[PDB]
Design a protein around this ligand. Structure first.
Ligand SMILES: *[C@@H]1O[C@H](CO)[C@@H](O[C@@H]2O[C@H](CO)[C@@H](O)[C@H](O)[C@H]2NC(C)=O)[C@H](O)[C@H]1NC(C)=O
Ligand SMILES: *[C@@H]1O[C@H](CO)[C@@H](O[C@@H]2O[C@H](CO)[C@@H](O)[C@H](O)[C@H]2NC(C)=O)[C@H](O)[C@H]1NC(C)=O
Ligand SMILES: *[C@@H]1O[C@H](CO)[C@@H](O[C@@H]2O[C@H](CO)[C@@H](O)[C@H](O)[C@H]2NC(C)=O)[C@H](O)[C@H]1NC(C)=O
Ligand SMILES: *[C@@H]1O[C@H](CO)[C@@H](O[C@@H]2O[C@H](CO)[C@@H](O)[C@H](O)[C@H]2NC(C)=O)[C@H](O)[C@H]1NC(C)=O
Ligand SMILES: *[C@@H]1O[C@H](CO)[C@@H](O[C@@H]2O[C@H](CO)[C@@H](O)[C@H](O)[C@H]2NC(C)=O)[C@H](O)[C@H]1NC(C)=O
Ligand SMILES: *[C@@H]1O[C@H](CO)[C@@H](O)[C@H](O)[C@H]1NC(C)=O
Ligand SMILES: *[C@@H]1O[C@H](CO)[C@@H](O)[C@H](O)[C@H]1NC(C)=O
Ligand SMILES: *[C@@H]1O[C@H](CO)[C@@H](O)[C@H](O)[C@H]1NC(C)=O
Ligand SMILES: *[C@@H]1O[C@H](CO)[C@@H](O)[C@H](O)[C@H]1NC(C)=O
Ligand SMILES: *[C@@H]1O[C@H](CO)[C@@H](O)[C@H](O)[C@H]1NC(C)=O
Ligand SMILES: [Ca+2]
Ligand SMILES: [Ca+2]
Ligand SMILES: [Ca+2]
Lengths: 367, 367, 367, 367, 367
């Protein structure tokens, strides 16, 4: 309108996008970098990649994009696309995206004082170490490391502002504890110039109820069936079939769990160790029961001729609770297996009750 | 043709795409923003992202793209590609797309009065909160928030026009109740200039029959089997195997349901709670029946020696309906479990009959 | 070669790609639009999107790209890339692609008379309504709607030529009946100028044998098992287990079918209704048999004390074919269920034998 | 270095990338097209698309990119990016890629004689007809059709050179027999100018052992179980359950096979026909055995009253090998079913032993 | 700031990005190429493609990008985007990416001496031969081959620097042994000019515990069940059903294994051969037991009439350990099958204990 056109013509008369916009070349350019978390799209524990929906916020002063408001009435701000003016090269250092730059290059808003505002949105994919050991009561500290790609501390004085979380959409699987930020420096051996960066640590807590019932109901059922087969009579007929079916069902369930979560060898989840203990206990009990039944139902003394087993079973039954002796030995072994399974379940429950994600507090908040 | 070429040469003589095309720089530019919904591609409840096929509609007046029709006979409209002329930076604020701009940049149609028309098509992916609690009788209000990225109310006077739905292709899984629109403002603490935006709320109702039979037939079958095992005699032989098989089948079905829909911890679906109640009832009944049978078939009084259980069962049988006492106690427990399951089914049906998506009206319209 | 270089320099001396190449600006530009179908990549019934491999064919006369062959010996054609010259903005209106333009922008072939040829290949993804109701004997009419995005009938006189199918690679799942074309106009209320478009209707017939055996063999097996359990004696022992296993297997098969095809609520497939009828019949028969066996094996008259059931069963047995009465009643009920299942199977076969995709003709052509 | 810079400035003084670089415009430009296969990424039998990793090789002489080596000491070659100089528009005609051009546009290497070298790498996706009928002993001839998009034989004299396979990485699922090439012409009715193209036929043989054990072990097991149930006594008790379980397992296996490979209706695989024959035989045998057992175990003559069945069974037993007659008839039927299954297995093995991929030679080479 | 702008204007006065920046054109340009491995994203054994997160490091001296620091106070470094200055065309030769260039083109950092630094990040997908034969104790040597695409050894003197691994994030499935580098030359028959390249061999060891328990627990269970059925009495009733169920479960497990890993025919994994041996042993044992039971339970001598079998079984029982003879023969056959299975398990364990990935050392380090 005879003023905006003239201003746009005048501002880019000799402007060079490659030049860092400072009046004095030996002075640093202060850039205020902030963040606006909006949504946690995905937490891939397989590839250790966190996907988030983030609006970056960058602000700096341009020495050449200044004008007198009185000389250009009615126009107070101008917009420049990607390549028209200089922008800081703030990139996510730990970006796992195949493009390495998920930001959408919007226009830079500059007002009459030369203050530029740049808010590039994007779906950032950052590679963070997923420590899945206290499954499912685990908290992940995924870091977002931002910094200038080719500017030092004496050229781009990067500064930090607290991230904005008043736009956040709850994920439904992870609970956002918070996203604190920190500014650190990267002094090199070559040179005394610092290399600042801004790191935002997305502290997230896994929501219990998402996997809670879906894993507890099968686990409760298989534990009840294990107790049942540890209490059923030896000569019941269906005990062997029930045990085999239970083992097949729970190993298919464990295969499904390993398909959903990754059973990373860096730190085996405690649930996997509990399952392994249950498997070895159930297998030993079933093998002992089957061999006793198949070696003592037809021959009264076919496998009972060793003396060491007889004396050790007598000592164990005297130290534990005190048709032939084979039935009593099988019952004692089954009771011992039941006691061991109960002790393991109790100790696992005790060890999982206390943790950094307080189980009692979590269930009180959820339920 | 000696007139279109001359007009195109004349129109871009001093035109600047960065300049907002207003005769007076202090006056707002009125932009009419409308929408044309065509198809609902996908409703991802996992990532809370809605995918739609939408044709945007933007209209504004350009002060510099005006010409005299008599001076240029035969030409009444001109087209300019993406970067040739100025276009409003209307973007989907809640876009979850990795590109953040799904629009296809078509040509801007300008006629002799300077009126520009811009209709960019695209497959928009917006992040909306999916409240899946009354599954499957749920209605989702997914919002599409459009607004200028870097213009205020005194620069780009955004206006709303009612969305066009006379091109809509039915989804087959979701029923489109409607897409009302609203224009709101975003006054900041810094400044009195409003920041208008246009929000279209895609109100969608899940079609019943899509998941209806596929979830009812397994649910009806498992409920019938639960009633059967709650009515079968205790000493039937196959009762334990039937119960275990039923539990395995329905827990696999629940795993499939959790695979298809997300069991979000924000609000657990009522179907999940009903399944949990059925699971606890069936497990308790099976455990009680098995323990009674295994502790009373060989010993007439091996687990019946406690007095509290005997007196409480006598009181319950006197207050409910009034071979040894163990069979009668097992029958009473089984009848109580059947009654509890029937009451839970009835109350769940009553609570799910009434809702915002009226169940009776929905089935009347569908069937 | 001193002539091609000179011609290329001369042709683009004042050429404007934005100008429509007509000698008279008030005269329409005739553009002949044709199509060359090559392959049907995918038919997504979930999102209602058809993916095809298509070579477009556009021809028009350019007034400015003309030269004298004698003055430029040896050169008869020239090529111009995307942005060098004017091309019609013919786009797929119902494109479901995220880019909205799957065409690969090749060079435009222009000869000495100004006749331009443009053949952009691409993998088009168009959104067509998939009416899957007569599964698997269904024919889909997916339309490809092409037209100018910003030109009317008095500016771009779009014309149609018959599509070329002598390059088509058979899909193996769908049979191509044909792709007829049609040209229609879109008169607006504003103005009398028509808005022509060219629509190609890809009429495709699903090949029977692809899903034929894969669905018939499980269906034949489950139908045979249903007849078997409807003919087996009540006191056989394995009847209940066989029925439960059959129901579980066929409901898993129906889950697989719903996973492969979409059970759209717009029109439920007839196979789904047949499965629902079979399910209700089998469930009723199994429930009746189980309740009769469990209420009459131990008590000669425990559930037979009502008079209405006895008299109605006597009337039914007198009107149908004419150890205690319970066995005869169970046999009569089982025979009635078998007869109902046979009638339903016969009527379903009769109703599916006749259709627009003639079943007898299809199997004669395939087998 | 005062010579490379001068040469680069001089070479592009009047160079036009649109001009075909020939001294005489009426003379063809000879382009030598070769190929360098590196890896067969994927063979999609569903969409009939072959994915390969290929380095193209194009060579031609540029008349204008010539210089005197003595006048420019030290520089013998120059490089030009995509748009700087002219390149042939050699494209894969049958490309199924959504971009239609998988080549990565590298620099063109030109030496002092004007000879240009262009080696664009890419991951080509070509649509070839997959004839999967002799599964798994099948050989696929997938063609790669390359040619100029807009040049005739009198403008671009395309020539063929033998493909290079000394970089090939074995796929592990397909064995590369060879990739012969051929040059053909495409004379049109309009004009006598030929339209040459270069076609490379990727002849590939499926490696036996990849699917060999994975399909043979289930097939061997189900065949052994079929023989077992065809040899087990009728009154064994578990015969019906074993047969039903075998049928369910093998139909799930066939569902898995149809999920992995496509059961295309163009030509049904022989394995599918063998499975159908086995299914009908097993179903008939099971139905006959069950009906005989259920109609003759309680009534000595309840279904044996027809005379035609009795006389035909007497004739068959006299012509085949020569408690009541029902057991003998059931045994004769079971033996006949076993003989039919054995004959079908033998004839299938004989017919699959001989083929273009010689089974004996293949197993000798592999084992 | 009156110095950076002047320097940027002066540096690109006559700069040509196509020219190789050397003072003398006949002298090679030394380029130091290094690598910085950060993460191993994926190891696809199906397509033989390795996905890694890598920061490249390239350094070279530019003759024209030099300036006097005193003449331009305060500015010591400059940045140029992709197309502004010359960069080496170092590409991954064995790249399997569809783009062939995963690098993100950042700015080139040049200081006053003309020394340029280029650090392009990217997610590289390279095609390496995956030799999966000693599953799961296998080490993969995946090579990353980098080199100039169109420069010889006398033009681009490529040099190697040791890769940096102090940023590496552990994968959790693969253990990084190391990434040694090597520089080699590619002399051609045409010419004596070498063609150097830099190859980094990513030596990776599969972590045991990732698949360890998940494959051992099913394998241990099926081995225990095989021993059980090889020790159970012949006339146990459930032996046949248990064997069939075990076979079905383990063949489903093998199908799952073939789904996860590829059973490549180049070299069959030892686990597959062990499974095949177990399958043939179990099948033979089950068939022999079933045929003996079905041919000797009703007829004392119905299949024992041959003399060769009787004499060979007598010899075997005399050479092995020394109701009718059929039971003793069945027991001897079952014991022989058990012994063969035990020998095969022992020899497989012995052969898998020793390997390049030392099993004992690996389990000592992990456990
Ligand atoms: C241009 O925009 C900047 C944005 O920061 C304005 O700077 C702010 O001005 C207010 C005065 O109302 C101060 O309270 C803030 O502290 C300033 N922020 C910073 C970072 O300096 C600046 O005033 C604007 N220019 C004009 C002419 O209005
Ligand atoms: C250019 O196009 C605009 C499109 O809006 C025309 O403006 C409309 O003109 C009609 C008159 O037939 C009015 O009824 C509408 O209310 C106008 N709409 C708006 C938004 O102003 C305009 O007339 C066209 N110019 C010419 C010269 O025809
Ligand atoms: C340029 O190409 C066009 C292609 O259509 C030629 O026009 C055709 O010419 C033939 C004469 O051999 C006629 O039979 C066709 O009917 C014409 N087609 C159309 C659409 O007009 C044209 O002749 C070519 N120019 C020259 C100089 O050869
Ligand atoms: C430029 O490169 C071409 C590449 O082909 C050279 O042409 C080859 O030259 C050799 C001589 O050593 C002949 O044996 C080949 O037959 C030629 N090939 C072709 C296709 O003509 C050419 O000599 C090079 N120019 C210079 C000046 O060395
Ligand atoms: C420009 O950067 C290069 C980076 O290598 C500098 O070269 C290094 O200079 C140091 C002196 O402090 C030497 O120890 C290294 O050996 C040099 N490296 C190489 C590869 O030559 C160079 O000095 C810098 N220029 C200026 C003016 O500081
Ligand atoms: C802006 O212009 C006014 C006159 O229009 C003048 O008084 C004022 O000093 C100017 N400001 C600057 C910063 O030049
Ligand atoms: C357009 O031109 C005609 C003469 O050709 C003139 O009468 C008319 O006033 C002009 N209109 C405008 C708006 O300049
Ligand atoms: C082309 O040039 C020839 C002479 O070379 C002339 O006779 C002829 O008329 C010209 N044609 C046109 C259309 O100008
Ligand atoms: C190249 O230059 C030399 C002199 O430097 C001259 O003798 C020779 O003829 C020239 N070659 C050509 C092809 O012009
Ligand atoms: C740089 O400039 C200073 C004077 O400012 C001069 O003494 C010195 O020699 C110059 N260096 C070069 C390399 O030209
Ligand atoms: Ca996840
Ligand atoms: Ca499909
Ligand atoms: Ca494949």
């Amino acid at each position: 309108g005879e003023f905006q056109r003239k201003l746009y013509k005048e501002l880019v008369k000799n402007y060079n996008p490659l030049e860092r916009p400072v009046a004095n070349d030996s002075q640093p350019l202060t850039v205020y970098f902030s963040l606006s978390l909006l949504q946690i799209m995905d937490v891939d524990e397989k590839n250790q990649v966190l996907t988030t929906n983030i609006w970056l916020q960058m602000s700096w002063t341009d020495h050449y994009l200044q004008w007198n408001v009185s000389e250009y009435p009615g126009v107070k701000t101008v917009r420049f696309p990607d390549g028209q003016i200089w922008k800081p090269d703030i990139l996510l250092y730990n970006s796992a995206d195949e493009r390495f730059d998920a930001t959408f290059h919007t226009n830079v808003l500059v007002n009459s004082s030369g203050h530029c505002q740049y808010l590039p949105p994007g779906i950032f994919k950052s590679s963070c170490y997923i420590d899945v050991r206290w499954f499912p009561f685990d908290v992940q500290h995924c870091k977002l490391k931002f910094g200038s790609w080719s500017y030092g501390g004496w050229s781009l004085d990067l500064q930090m502002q607290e991230a904005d979380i008043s736009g956040y959409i709850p994920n439904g699987e992870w609970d956002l504890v918070g996203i604190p930020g920190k500014r650190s420096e990267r002094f090199y051996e070559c040179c005394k110039e610092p290399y600042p960066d801004v790191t935002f640590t997305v502290t997230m807590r896994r929501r219990t109820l998402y996997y809670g019932l879906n894993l507890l109901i099968p686990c409760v059922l298989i534990s009840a069936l294990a107790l049942l087969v540890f209490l059923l009579p030896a000569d019941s007929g269906e005990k062997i079939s029930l045990g085999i079916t239970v083992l097949l069902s729970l190993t298919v369930f464990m295969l499904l769990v390993a398909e959903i979560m990754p059973a990373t060898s860096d730190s085996v989840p405690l649930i996997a160790q509990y399952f392994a203990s249950t498997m070895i206990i159930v297998g030993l009990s079933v093998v002992v029961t089957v061999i006793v039944l198949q070696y003592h139902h037809h021959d009264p003394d076919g496998g009972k001729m060793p003396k060491w087993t007889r004396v050790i079973l007598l000592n164990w039954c005297a130290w534990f609770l005190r048709c032939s002796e084979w039935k009593f030995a099988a019952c004692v072994v089954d009771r011992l297996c039941l006691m061991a399974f109960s002790v393991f379940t109790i100790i696992c429950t005790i060890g999982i009750l206390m943790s950094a994600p307080n189980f009692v507090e979590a269930v009180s908040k959820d339920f």
